[PDB]
Design a protein around this nucleic acid. Structure first.
Length: 63
DNA sequence: GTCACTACCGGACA
DNA sequence: GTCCGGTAGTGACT
C-alpha cells in the first residue's frame, strides 16, 4: 500500500508524443514532493526513520 | 550499431 | 500548481 501519512498521485499525459503515458509522484507527511524513485530513495537514506515518545500519546480526558 | 523501453528531471507556463 | 520533452541508461538483437 502507501506508507502511513504519505500520498500517491497518478496522472496520465493527454497530448504530444508522450500522450497516454503515466506520471506518479509522492507527497510526504510534511508535504515534500518526490517525482522519482531515485530522489525518494536518497531522501529515505537519512529521513526514512520515524520515532515515537510517550508524550505523543494522550491518555487523558479534559473536564 | 539500431530499437524499444523505462526512468529522471529540466523547464515552459504569465 | 499545471504540463510535456530531451537525455541517459539497459538489454535483446536478423
Amino acid at each position: 500500500p502507501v506508507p502511513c501519512g504519505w500520498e500517491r498521485v497518478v496522472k496520465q499525459r493527454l497530448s504530444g508524443k508522450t500522450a497516454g503515458k503515466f506520471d506518479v509522484y509522492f507527497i510526504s507527511p510534511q508535504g515534500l514532493k518526490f517525482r522519482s524513485k531515485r530522489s525518494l530513495a536518497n531522501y529515505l537514506l537519512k529521513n526514512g526513520e520515524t520515532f515515537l515518545k510517550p508524550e505523543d500519546f494522550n491518555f487523558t480526558v479534559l473536564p
